[PDB]
Design a protein around this ligand. Structure first.
Ligand SMILES: CC(C)(COP(=O)(O)OP(=O)(O)OC[C@H]1O[C@@H](n2cnc3c(N)ncnc32)[C@H](O)[C@@H]1OP(=O)(O)O)[C@@H](O)C(=O)NCCC(=O)NCCS
Ligand SMILES: CC(C)(COP(=O)(O)OP(=O)(O)OC[C@H]1O[C@@H](n2cnc3c(N)ncnc32)[C@H](O)[C@@H]1OP(=O)(O)O)[C@@H](O)C(=O)NCCC(=O)NCCS
Lengths: 179, 177
């Protein structure tokens, strides 16, 4: 049941579906070592079948409006993932998560995809409050937030376990009302 | 059966199927009151629907993904203290609570909260306790300050309630045993 959110001449967001699993799994394996530097989970990655269960879970949430999982394709090549880890329908708030294949960084691809996604959901009107939580020492992530006009709202002490230590987490938000 | 002691007159009991009739009654009795601060009370309907929700929370509770405890005062069900959600890897949980309106003003929530947090910190599986609460919910913000939570931030228009969006304070306390 295909769903695309245009981003640019070379970029688009496609709702995750079963056919994306093999390529997404490979993409995770390919970037596993570098992602483990910023994220805890790449570690537990094992088989394509387990990755499938996870996507399958997100697809149900995506369909019920309780989360979203989009894959970023650059020139028809899978380049990364942009998601709402959770949506709070009544508060019209959503928490954002993302990562890019390492050789796709530095081209404003995440910023553009993010800008397109947020715009899409604010115009639909079902999400107006967008949140990014990211480790205080995640430089690239904090830069995405700033560049995309999120307001720092606070800092959560030792909120995130990563590589043997609990790290502080900046909390950013941006409110968009398509009046 | 799980009980966390609090005082000679107070204890916390993990919610179970047997509590459903009385919990459903307490919720009906306090609906109007709770709607002043909470959005969920007005979707309340039948005892069956309540049993549905408790069965699901009991599974989360057993799996360690949330906890639902009932506060008993001299053997009378007086409110709920729960971890709305736990992030096992981060050893962090989000706190939710409410008291029947007539049990306010006796430190019942503070005492229960204190025992609960100390219990989990001794277990070692939760070290970070979080309280999200509306900037204008005086009673809740008092619970967080009274119990030594530190204000970490203020979330703009994070909660929709009674026709308005409200800024929400985020408090946290880290306890290592
Ligand atoms: C976080 C992450 C997605 C950011 O990647 P990114 O490529 O830096 O992000 P953007 O797409 O916004 O690109 C910004 C960069 O591209 C440049 N750029 C080029 N064209 C651009 C455009 N059209 N618009 C905006 N920036 C543009 C900017 O100058 C900037 O360059 P610089 O960082 O070299 O100064 C990436 O580092 C990654 O996947 N990290 C690992 C996983 C992780 O940390 N995820 C987040 C956990 S909270
Ligand atoms: C939030 C709520 C649980 C707070 O109730 P509470 O009774 O005020 O909480 P506490 O247990 O901390 O009791 C503190 C009060 O009892 C008093 N008290 C008496 N003995 C006490 C004791 N031994 N220890 C601590 N406080 C004591 C305090 O002085 C204080 O009185 P005050 O309100 O006049 O200042 C209650 O108002 C409620 O259920 N609200 C509606 C639902 C809601 O807001 N939930 C939270 C959503 S974030």
């Amino acid at each position: 049941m295909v769903e695309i959110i245009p981003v640019s001449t070379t970029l688009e967001l496609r709702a995750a579906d079963e056919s994306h699993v093999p390529a997404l799994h490979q993409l995770v394996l390919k970037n596993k070592a570098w992602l483990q530097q910023s994220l805890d989970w790449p570690q537990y990655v094992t088989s394509q079948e387990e990755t499938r269960k996870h996507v399958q879970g997100n697809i149900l949430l995506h369909q019920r409006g309780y989360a979203k999982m989009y894959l970023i394709f650059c020139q028809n090549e899978m380049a990364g993932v942009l998601s709402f880890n959770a949506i709070e329908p009544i508060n019209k708030a959503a928490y954002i998560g993302y990562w890019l294949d390492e050789s796709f960084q530095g081209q404003g691809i995440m910023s553009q995809s993010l800008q397109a996604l947020m715009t899409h959901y604010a115009r639909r009107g079902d999400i107006r409050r967008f949140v990014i939580k990211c480790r205080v020492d995640n430089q690239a992530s904090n830069a995405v937030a700033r560049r995309n006009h999120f307001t720092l709202e606070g800092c959560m002490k030792q909120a995130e376990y990563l590589n043997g230590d609990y790290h502080d987490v900046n909390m950013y938000a941006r409110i968009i009302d398509a009046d």
